[PDB]
Amino acid sequence: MVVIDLLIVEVVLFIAALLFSGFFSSSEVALISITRAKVHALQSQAKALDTLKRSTDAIQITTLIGSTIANVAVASLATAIGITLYGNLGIAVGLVVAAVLVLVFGEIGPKMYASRYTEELALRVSRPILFFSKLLYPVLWVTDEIKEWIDVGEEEGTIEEEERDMLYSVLRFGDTTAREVMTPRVDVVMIEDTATLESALAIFNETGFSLIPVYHERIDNIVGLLNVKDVFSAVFRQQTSATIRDLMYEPYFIPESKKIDELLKELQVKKQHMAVVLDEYGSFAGIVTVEDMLEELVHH
Amino acid sequence: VVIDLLIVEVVLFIAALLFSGFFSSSEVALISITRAKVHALQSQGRKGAKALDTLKRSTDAIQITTLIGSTIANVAVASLATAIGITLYGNLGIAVGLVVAAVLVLVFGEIGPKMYASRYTEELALRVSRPILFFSKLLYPVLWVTDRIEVVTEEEIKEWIDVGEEEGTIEEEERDMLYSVLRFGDTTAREVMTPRVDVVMIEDTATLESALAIFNETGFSLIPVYHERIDNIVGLLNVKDVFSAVFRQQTSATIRDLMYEPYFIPESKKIDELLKELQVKKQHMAVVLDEYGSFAGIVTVEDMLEELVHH
């Protein structure tokens, strides 16, 4: 080695470390700032961005470690370059200059400019941040009664006794879970992802339903939902190669602990109306229709 | 000497790592404390708090003051870890100083101190309120520089439902309950709050004998309390407690002694959340503030259920 050689190796490592911090700091801003619905439309038109968005906090962990390690090195290198140039006072010089640059070009700067060009930057840093996350994945693994309250309201003038019954259901609506209102697996209708469109139409008429699940060689592995309008329109327009895998649309899975009040709001946002349910092990449990949720309100 | 300067850097290293914990832990706790909770602290005779409000008015300043601090502090941790490191392990010490500083700053300077903020967001805020406020005053030039540098369609529900009615996934009979339940969740407190102007309150300095006059004149059972201005709500006063007092007061307790801290909420609190949150607290009224921390109205459980029942 040599003094000049090492210093030039350090300055390029110092220059590269600063540029790496900007990529990590600006990536969080662009990653999180993206609107959820806009991400789905782009995905339909990315796939890694949707993967990282599944765990919003995961993006924060990966980026945090990236920016922190990058900025530590900027100081580490500049203060080695600092002392080999100005002596013990070089740690002060290195601390001053490395501190100024990490803010200007390493954290403050890139965060602001990420909102201006948030579109292109978000997609460009989707894949690499997803690669770093897989590298930083092991560390991430380490991170990992009622009548009393109401009767009082009426006495305080808060509630009117006429509006008591309706209140009761609104409370039982939030407390109710998907496991209670759903339909059990044993009684659910199903069609495999490898079946002729003619057979689905039979199922659609024998049972009469419009959305029948699509399992994948196993009752536990649901891979899509099949609308009857998609099948009836497929056999009519003779498509020599028209399998269920094409017509099925990816479902929206939920846990058994999901409250039905949230489910109903979300389903009408995503233009869907049936939801698939999974258990703690990731198997298949049932299906909740908007009708199933409101059945308790219909029977009072 | 070599040994005495290595002793100066090892303590400054420990200190620099503590600052990054101060800036990092304070950043999490301060932003997460809801502005409705900050309003409660000021009227509570709480330590600091009055400073905690000054910072909450600017959401950028809190992010700049914590970023600038934790950055300079983390650069200092590394600058000192390589200074100590390079003297201990030659030119390989620049590498050890990068590893030790980067693994400690994350664990004990950024990630770890964030954990204490989540569990203790309130007390940490009042303990770090004033400090971050004089850091902002001296970081003023950069802050000015950074400031200079800086769909619920009615038809969608109808079509979406009728599409469901066609699928059989929804029923036509159950349309009303569905159209209403959607409006219930998407309704804010503002839309159901009795406006500030029409609210009847009692100043905390008033007499219990005067409170009774208000309870009878209006007929309400619970009337808010405003410490100095109508913009301010410091508590709610139940008539049942005022009557029991005047009957056997003896000590003549004032409003501040008999009132109770309200449930402050923002104008945006979806009533769907407000109902479950209020009935869990066994409380049925909720004061409603605004972004600037003023007073804007109140919400009772009937208000949230009125439009739904009458519809």
Residue numbers in the entry:
A (entry chain B): 1 to 45, 50 to 148, 169 to 324
B (entry chain A): 2 to 151, 164 to 324
Task: Quote the study on this structure.
CNNM/CorB proteins are a broadly conserved family of integral membrane proteins with close to 90,000 protein sequences known. Structurally, CNNM/CorB proteins are defined by a conserved core consisting of a transmembrane domain (TMD) and a cytosolic cystathionine-β-synthase (CBS)-pair domain. Here, we determine the crystal structure of an archaeal CorB ortholog in two distinct conformations (apo and Mg2+-ATP-bound).
Further insight into the conformation in the absence of bound ATP came from the crystal structure of a MtCorBΔC R235L mutant, homologous to a Jalili syndrome mutant (R407L) that is unable to bind ATP in human CNNM4. Crystals of MtCorBΔC R235L mutant purified in UDM were obtained by vapor diffusion in presence of 0.1 M sodium citrate pH 5.5, 50 mM Li2SO4, and 11% PEG4000, but they diffracted poorly to 6 Å. Subsequent additives screening improved the resolution to 3.8 Å with the addition of 10 mM MgSO4. In the apo structure, the TMD remains in the same inward-facing conformation, but the cytosolic domains undergo major structural rearrangements. The CBS-pair domain has completely dissociated from the disc-like dimeric configuration to a more elongated, open conformation with different domain-domain contacts. To our knowledge, this dimeric configuration is not observed in any available CBS-pair domain structures. In agreement with the AUC results, the loss of ATP binding disrupted the dimerization of the CBS-pair domain, which then makes contact with the helix-turn-helix motif from TMD. In addition, the dimeric AHB dissociates and binds to the CBS2 motif of the neighboring molecule, competing for the Mg2+-ATP binding site. The two conformations are interchangeable by a 90° rotation of both protomers.
